[PDB]
From a paper:
To test the possibility of a pre-existing 53BP1TT homodimer, we created a 53BP1TT mutant (53BP1TT-PN) in which E1549 and D1550 were replaced by a proline and an asparagine, respectively, to introduce a 3D structure-preserving β-turn in 53BP1TT. These mutations eliminate the six salt bridges at the 53BP1TT dimer interface but do not affect the small molecule-binding surface. We verified that the structural integrity of 53BP1TT-PN was preserved by determining a 2.20 Å resolution crystal structure of this protein variant. The backbone dynamic properties of wild-type 53BP1TT and 53BP1TT-PN were quite similar as shown using NMR relaxation measurements. As expected, 53BP1TT-PN also bound UNC1078. Instead, they only bind to and stabilize a pre-existing 53BP1TT homodimer population, shifting the equilibrium toward homodimer. When overlaid, the 1H-15N HSQC spectra of wild-type 53BP1TT and 53BP1TT-PN showed small chemical shift changes that map to the inter-53BP1TT interface in 53BP1TT-UNC3474. We showed that 53BP1TT constructs engineered to prevent auto-association—while preserving the ligand binding cage—have no affinity for the small molecule ligands, and yet, they bind H4KC20me2 and p53K382me2 like wild-type 53BP1TT.
The DNA damage response protein [name] (p53-binding protein 1) influences the cell cycle dependency of DNA double-strand break (DSB) repair pathway selection. Our work therefore identifies an auto-associated form of [name]—autoinhibited for chromatin binding—that can be stabilized by small molecule ligands encapsulated between two [name] protomers.
Residue numbers in the entry: 1482 to 1603
Write the structure that this text describes.
Amino acid sequence: HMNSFVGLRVVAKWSSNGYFYSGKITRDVGAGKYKLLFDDGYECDVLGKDILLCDPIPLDTEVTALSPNEYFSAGVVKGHRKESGELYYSIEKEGQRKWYKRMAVILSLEQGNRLREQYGLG
C-alpha cells in the first residue's frame, strides 16, 4: 500500500540488543526487512517489527537520554526543534528540561514497545 519507505527517518533495533537507535531506511531488501543506515554510520538489515516509523519521536514519549557522566537516564520528550538543520529533543528529567542531540536519545525495549501499536512496521 505504501509508496516507499526509502528515505524515511526511523528509530530501530537489531536482534540481541534491546535499544532503538535513530536512523533512516536506505533500501527495501524484501523478506520483511529493510536496510537501515544508523546516524552513527552503521548499516544493517532490520526486521520490520523492529522499526518505529516516527520522526521526531513524539511528545510525551518516555525515552532514554544519554546524559553527562556517561549516564543513561530515562526521561520524557517535552519538545523538539531544529537548530541549523539538526534535530534536538527537549527531555524532561527530575522535573527539569534539557536539550539533547538526536543521537543522544534512544528507546529501551519497554519504551519502544509502547510505540509499536501506533508506529511499528510489524
